Amino acid sequence: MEGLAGYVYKAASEGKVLTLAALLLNRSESDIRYLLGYVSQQGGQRSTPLIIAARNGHAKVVRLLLEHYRVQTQQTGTVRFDGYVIDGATALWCAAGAGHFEVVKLLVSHGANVNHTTVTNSTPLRAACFDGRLDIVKYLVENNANISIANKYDNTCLMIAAYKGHTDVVRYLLEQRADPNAKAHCGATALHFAAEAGHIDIVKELIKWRAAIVVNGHGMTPLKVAAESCKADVVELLLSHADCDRRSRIEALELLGASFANDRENYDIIKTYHYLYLAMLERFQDGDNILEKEVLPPIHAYGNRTECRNPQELESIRQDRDALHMEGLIVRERILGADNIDVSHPIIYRGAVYADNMEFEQCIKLWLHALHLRQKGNRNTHKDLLRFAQVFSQMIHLNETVKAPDIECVLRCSVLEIEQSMNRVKNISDADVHNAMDNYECNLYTFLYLVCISTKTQCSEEDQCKINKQIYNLIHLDPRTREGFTLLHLAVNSNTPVDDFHTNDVCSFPNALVTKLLLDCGAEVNAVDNEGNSALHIIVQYNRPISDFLTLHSIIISLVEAGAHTDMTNKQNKTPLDKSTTGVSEILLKTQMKMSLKCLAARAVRANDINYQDQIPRTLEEFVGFH
Amino acid sequence: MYVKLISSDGHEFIVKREHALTSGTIKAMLSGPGQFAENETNEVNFREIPSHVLSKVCMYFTYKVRYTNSSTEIPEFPIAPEIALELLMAANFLDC
Amino acid sequence: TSLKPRVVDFDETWNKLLTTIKAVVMLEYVERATWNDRFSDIYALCVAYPEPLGERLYTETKIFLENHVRHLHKRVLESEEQVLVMYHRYWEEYSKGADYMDCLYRYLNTQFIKKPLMEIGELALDMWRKLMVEPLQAILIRM
Amino acid sequence: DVFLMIRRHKTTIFTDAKESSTVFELKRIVEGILKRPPDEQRLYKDDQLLDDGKTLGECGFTSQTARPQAPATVGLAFRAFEALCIEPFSSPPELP
Amino acid sequence: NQDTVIDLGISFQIYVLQAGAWPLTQAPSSTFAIPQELEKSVQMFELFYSQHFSGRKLTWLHYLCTGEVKMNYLGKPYVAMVT
Structure with missing residues (x-):
């Protein structure tokens, strides 16, 4: 019984004895076995009564359950509530994740499930390492359980213990002949995965056990990973390795100084200059077997600087903060390459800092470079286009001119990113289709915000033609949201969301300029959504007819003049006259x-x-269909 | 000034030229060869549509000319259920 | 006898329509009863059941226009003595014929072409340009 | 603004006039657009004769009775006066 | 561009202007009847304005307007411009 399942779940949640004794007896065998072998659904998540017994620290009730009955620990349930909520885990997995040793030892003592594998084949050792309790890990090792169980993306327990403050677990692993040179999905040999955490003692243990140095899947040595994360102690420790050589030592110091220039938590421009000076002094210290810089050509996004090939220019730019920021960005781009995951985030942070000081042009240049790098890396830039629409709306709200080629570039980037978003939505069946659809809707909304901004900016004929070309290219894909909303419907609908930032001051829907521009660019004016409402069906449903009557009048005329039917009906057979309300x-x-x-x-x-x-003619069957 | 509309079943209908030019197909029929510029007949021979649908489209021509733009008092067109689905194809042919 | 989508033979109706549009393009005298009957034939061929012969009609009209323009091209090319007089007469005839044919093909233009392809009058003008004055560009311009 | 659907055997004429007017100009305009002698016009409303001087508003139709959407029939049998032989419109097919 | 040639018989040069912007006021009722010679011109502009600018009513000022006069009963001497 589902009600009895909830009753025994509540009884195990309180950790009582007589309540569960009364709620699991005086019945037959089949129903009792079903009750002890089923999960209850609370808060949209399914969990065993044993799961809620182990999670709340009530090990006495599960001990008496194991003594009185033969309940198994092989029940399929979720992993945790910390943003993972994937099923397939066993009861022993969450028992190890609950941070209680007694429930784990009593589950092992009767029907051990130490070698359990979920859909990600994550053993309870993963949860024990994530919790960080050394006793549970020691018991699991002593229970003849394999510690070399790598995931489908090769998440070894040593790496997941190294990512947090669990140096005791990593130690107890490594003096039991753990993996010295095991890679991962991204090629992280636990040192790329440990230097990001920055735990110096874990890196000490790995160096003492000779974990070695090798580049990961992104071509980054763990020293460079430590330098990217603005963590000097692990940088020093990895530098003291007697095989790093002068070239890697110099570029690691230079990358650390670069990272210190543009970072949220660790921002020190004096440390930036000092580390750059240390890198340069070690370069220009002999005059023989010198290590000259592989200076990249200047990039317009970072002004027009050409790195610092002499200590004299570095000393000249010592007190100039923006030059130091651009120099750090340039040398970070050179060291990490143009195809790295983490190379774009400091550029975004520097752009945000520039925009806070109302230096909008350099902000636009930096964010355009970040957008180009992220699109070359083929990553989700739905948040970046929203940032572009926000900073463009703030320029209009501050009555500042907006460069039309910048609007064209960001619109072309948005059109492209909507294309790969459609490709990702089509390719993904049910892996992250909800996140993909959220990204798709957000990208459509950001495109609308950029179009609305472009309508409010004075532009030349060629720039307007380029903007209209990008809009035309996006319209010919016919993008649709979850509820069949085309790009014309959202620009007509008053229920289209607007971001809470500066986009409220500019992007107000419905907007007649956006609808007129879309119709001039060739929007399907007779297109209907999933409910069947056309573009005319949503504008009549506007609840503010007189407050912005100038907008409402200028958009009804545009839709009808484009060729929208004033008599067509939705799936509920409602004329827009009837739905005018x-x-x-x-x-x-x-x-x-x-x-x-x-x-x-x-x-x-x-x-x-x-x-x-x-x-009737087949060309008229549709005519009867919507009329 | 007045044009003539002949149905398939012998029936002849005469309506004003401005009233009958509101449909694109009749405008195309009047234009081109065979205008027959007597200024009084301009007779077009509809070999397909029956007489009742031609009467109804002539009534529609007069109705639209009278109510091309007026106040909210626009009376509904009295279409019988039997004449529908044959006037729909007639309006498709005439591009009314 | 009615405006119903019916199984209609393409050969006979297309032969009648071809004769009528040849008379129209050449600006010869054509009976207006036959002209209205060709509107009826155009409507029957445009929404014929179960084969909507709009693509076939468009292709056949394009082929006929190409043949007519090529014939006029050959005539005006062999009449080099008064190529401009012949071109003026044939351009008057073909412009009037194209206007009258776009009038005749109104249903095809409004129900199949636009709702991409090109309108029948537009197609006639394009064929005239591409096979009547494009080969005769040099001679016409220089004379 | 009265609207009349004048009938004569198969021929049908749609005409616009005023409520308070004589049928003299009506006979003259149908004479002009029919090309017939002006002595054969004998207008019939519901198969009965009417005065040639009485206003057509009092003849049996008005604005509320005769409309552009549904005009009132007026027989126009001509003297060879001939008997009223107004051919009815073809009946629509029996819908399922 | 009308289907029939509209016999205006008039030269028409209206100065259409906004309501809430101009300080012109018709607070008195000022009952006036448009004469028949220009009755056709005023009706055609109502059809034109409502077709190209939908949702706009046109109240006509009868005191800030003028024009030539056709005095057929006077023998047409000395064509004058009056309100």
């Missing part, structure tokens, strides 16, 4: 209605339910 909108529509005999005849056919299949 407003005297003003009904008056405007009736003024703009162009009466025809075909519409009247089709309305009479649909009203009388006349059998019109195979009695």
Whole structure:
């Protein structure tokens, strides 16, 4: 019984004895076995009563359950509530994750499940290492359980213990002949995965056990990973390795100084200059076997600087903060390459800092470079286009001019990213289709914000032609949201969300300029959504007919002049006159209605339910369909 | 000034030229060869549509000319259920 | 006898339509009853059941226009003595014929072409340009 | 603004006039657009004769009775006056 | 561009202007009847304005307007411009 399952779940949640004794007896065997072998669903998540017994620290109730009955620990359930919520885990997995040793030892003592594998084949050793309790790990090792169980993406327990403050677990692993040179999905040999955490003692233990140095899947040595994370202690420890050599030592110091220039938590420009000076002094210290810089050509995003090939220019730019920031960005881009995951985030942070000081042009350049790098890396830039729309709206709200080629570039980037978003939505069946659809809707909304901003910016004829070309290219894909909303419907609908940042001051929907531009660019004006509402069906449903009547009048005329039917019906068979729900909108529509005999005849056919299949031309069956 | 519309079943209908030019197909029929510039007949021979649908489209022509743009008092067109699905194809042919 | 989508033979109706549009393009006298009957034939061929012969009609009209323009091209090319007089007469005839044919093909233009392809009058003008004055560009310009 | 659907055997004429007017100009305009002698016009409303000087508003139709959407029939049998032989419109097919 | 040639018989040069912007006021009722010679021109502009600018009513000022006069009963001497 589901009610009895909830009752025994609540009884095990309180850790009592008599309640569970009364709620699991005086019955047959099959129902009791079903009750002890089923999960209860609370808060949208399914868990065993044993799971809620071990999670709340009630090990006495599960001990008496194991003594009185033969309940198994092989029940399938979720992993945790910390943003993972994937099923397939066993009861012993969450028992190890609960941080209670006694429940783990009693589950092992009767029907051990130490070698359990979920859909990600993550053993309870993973949860024990994540919790960080050394006793549970020691018991699991002593229970003849394999510690070399790598995941499908090769998440060894040593790496997941090294990512947090669990140096005792990593130690107890490594003096039991753990993996010295095991890679991962990204090629992280636990040192790329440990230096990001920055735990110096874990790196000490790995160096003492000779974990060695090798580049990961992104071509980054663990020293460079430590330098990227603005953590000097692990940088020093990895430097003291007697095989790093002068070239890697110098570039690691230079990368550390670069990272210190643009970072949220660790921002020290004096440390940036000092580490750059240390890197340069070690370069120019002999005059023989010198290590000259592989200076990249100047990039317009970072001004026009050409690195610092002499200590004199570095000393000259010592007190100039923006030059130091751009120099750090340039040398970070050079060291980490143009195809790295983490190379774009400091550029975004520097752009945000520049925008806070109302230096919008350099912010636009930096964020355009970050967008180009992320699109070359083929990553989700749905948040970056929202940032572009926000900073463009703030320029309009501050009455600052906006460069039209920048709008063209960001619009082309948005069109492309919507194309790969459609490709990702089509390719992904049910892996992250909800996140993909959220990204798709957000990208469509950001494209609308950028279009609305472009309508409010004075642009040249060529720039306007390029903007219209990008809009035309996106329209010819016919993008649709979850509820069939085309790009014209959202620009018409008043329910289209607007971001809480500066986009509220500019991007207000419905907007007549956006609708007119879309119709000029060739939007399907007769296109309907999943519910069947056309573009005209949503504008009449506007609840503010007089507050922005100038907008409402200028958009009803545009839709009808484009060729929208003023008599077509949705799936509920409702004329926009009937769905007008407003005297003003009904008056405007009736003024703009162009009466025809075909519409009247089709309305009479649909009203009388006349059998019109195979009695009319096929080009007119659709005409009866929406009329 | 007045044009003539002949149905398939012998029936002849005469309506004003401006009233009958509101449909694109009749405008195309009047244009081109065979205008027959007597300024009084301009007779077009509809070999397909019956007489009742032609009467109804002539009534529609007069109705639309009268109510091309007026106040909210626009009376509904009295379409019988039997004449529908044959006036729909007629309006498709006439592009009304 | 009615505006119903029916199984209609393409050969006979297309032969009648071809004769009528040849008379129209050449600006010869054509009976207006036959002209209205060709509107009826155009409607029947445009929404014929179960084969909507709109693509076939468009291709056949394009082929006929190409043949007519090529014939006029050959005539005006062999009449080099008064190529401009012949081109003026044939351009008047073909412009009037193209306008009258776009009038005749109104249903095809409004129900199959636009709702991409090109309109029948537009197609006639394009064929005239591409096979009547494009080969005769040099001679016409220089004379 | 009265609207009349004048009938004569198969021929049908749609005409616009005023409520308070004589049928003299009506006979003259149908004479002009029919090309017939002006002595054969004998208008019939519901198969009965009417005065040639009485206003057509009092003849049996008005604005509320005769409309552009549904005009009132007026027989126009001509003297060879001939008997009223107004051919009815073809009946629509029996819908399922 | 009308289907029939509209016999205006008039030269028409209206100055259409906004309502809430201009300080012109018709607070008195000022009952006036448009004469028949220009009755056709005023009706055609109502059809034109409502077709190209939907949702706009046009109240006509009868005191800030003028024009030539056709005095057929006067023998047409000395064509004058009056309100």
